[PDB]
Amino acid sequence: TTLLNPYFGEFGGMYVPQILMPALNQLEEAFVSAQKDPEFQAQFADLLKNYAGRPTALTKCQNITAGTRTTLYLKREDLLHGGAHKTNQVLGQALLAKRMGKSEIIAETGAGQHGVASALASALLGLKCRIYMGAKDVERQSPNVFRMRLMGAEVIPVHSGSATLKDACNEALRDWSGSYETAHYMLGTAAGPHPYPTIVREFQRMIGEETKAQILDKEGRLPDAVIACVGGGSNAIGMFADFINDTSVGLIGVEPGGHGIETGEHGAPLKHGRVGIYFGMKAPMMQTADGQIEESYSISAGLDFPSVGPQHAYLNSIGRADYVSITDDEALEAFKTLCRHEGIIPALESSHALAHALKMMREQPEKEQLLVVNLAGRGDKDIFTVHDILKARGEI
Template identity: 75%
Template structure:
């Protein structure tokens, strides 16, 4: 079926869905185009963004965090938006589209819970029913957001299948929509999925970059040298980048989750370390096994724990317009603590990925004069307990290490030598057993 708007970004995108959903996607695309040309729709949306959501959001200069450098670091404060994250921007737009299509109910998926909260508040405001799918692991680690959703009338459905994370929530939401599309609208939470969702989300999120451009010109008199945003599905980043893509002087950087290290396989860097395939109704880079099955992603932040990425980012990577990098959980926690202690701002762990790479840039060349903007896509209230547990474990390991050192220091020199000899022998035995077991496994596999 032909589309009214381009369904592809280079080779990426498309509509890889059951045939039964094709007319529904066409109806949504047509409604979106009509709404964009309808002054009543755009005026109402802009009023909601201003008077309900709290736009424009601030562009904050971080003077303390960069005091030992020549960098002027700004944060685009999407954390100050009603709902606590950038998700509210496009959710209000999609909710109005759903009303325009006379849908009675909304379906959504959520990872960190930020999109779920945004959907719940929009549906409460516009008096629509909603059910939200969420991986069971995410329900546990984001319990505060789950309570917020239910408080606003949303039905939250935990998903226990697969890895019990965002990937599985997306699958279940899509399955639900395939059976209930006549009366429901699928309010997809990121710039991914089948056309026209990536285009719709991009258009409703580009207010972030539009405001940023105006604000930085007002405060600095010129455009920034670099702009950074975290990458999961990619909605906050594409919203920030869109109005700067044609500004060749601005270096755009998307930051993926390296998790416990790319080499461990426990990460969510699908764009740079995935392979092109079909997933979630689109053609895009995907984390895959050697057999072509979807590989489980990992991130300390639930919102980035996704095995693929939106088609716009795949295209921007392919043409080299945006640089895509990754940072580890360790770097994320360091950045999280740094901004808390120096600026009194608690960022979401998702946003802390972009902040971590910005700090890496600054520390690499502190004397360089530059202007950097980081999209602080959400606030970190939801992540406080996660960070607390990580820091507690880190402290316990440190205390155990100090205790062992203290114990060893009380031993006689002869005893210390025998202890070290034992440790070295044990390491040698362990290594030998490991090598032997690998040999046995190889012979019998």
């Protein structure tokens, strides 16, 4: 029994062990209560503004669209404290943990950005933070691991399974299954069991709300389309949410195409996977023919997840939102283009979104279109990766 619908159409649900159902119920009630609580909202708004730095700029990118009829704005989540949109919802979830009287935080991370966000929020708000991270991720993300540890968080490598994000996802749930009485699970995307897809959306929706206000102010009309990369779905749904009822506004989600969809080495389950049940939800999964959860792949660690949030699967099904893919090489080009022509170093994740906007422009350069790309993070974290790639392909 729940207060809110756990499904978006056929997608979503609460596919957790029975032992965790009271935790999910408790979190839903706390959320529903918090959303009605002006005190909660004021504290959240205070952290967002004075700590994280909201509102974020909306930047018109003139150089990269010159000679075409595309006007492109970037929503600057890259400028949020921590360097990515992940910070927004961790602040809300940290306040929820406090509302429930919880003193500890569990979080999963892959790339490490959500873990850093969880760690910073925990430091600020006096929660003891443990972060589970696949050991292969720990190995690759020494900077983020160290940032988390500087901020007082315990980082616990996960050696089971493929020792990556999904395994960290499981471990977090395993911990929570035994510790929910003291700990809150601060899930890092708009996926997993209800009520997380709903909570994460609501605690990211300021992205789209601000974008709407900013675009009405600057352009006098809504965008033709808003474009975001889809890892698990949080930055995208945060951008989309406030435009869902504005039926003229296109909602485009960009999954990682990796080495190419045809190679099978990608992270695009919404369009190229199969519905399954994993991580507490019924959603598109990349999986083997016999139903083992498959390994995804992307150049960008933040998109390298074999599933997707259920609201995206739903918005796709009904034709409200359209989902596309962008390959490693396309994302790399977009990264280089933004650095060189706008002086902004984008996260490789959001470089997927930018690449798709650039394709919309280049394919039809006399089409008048007003586009917003969610620049969900900065790409400082990616500069070593790009260097190594650019030297190996002989741009040295």
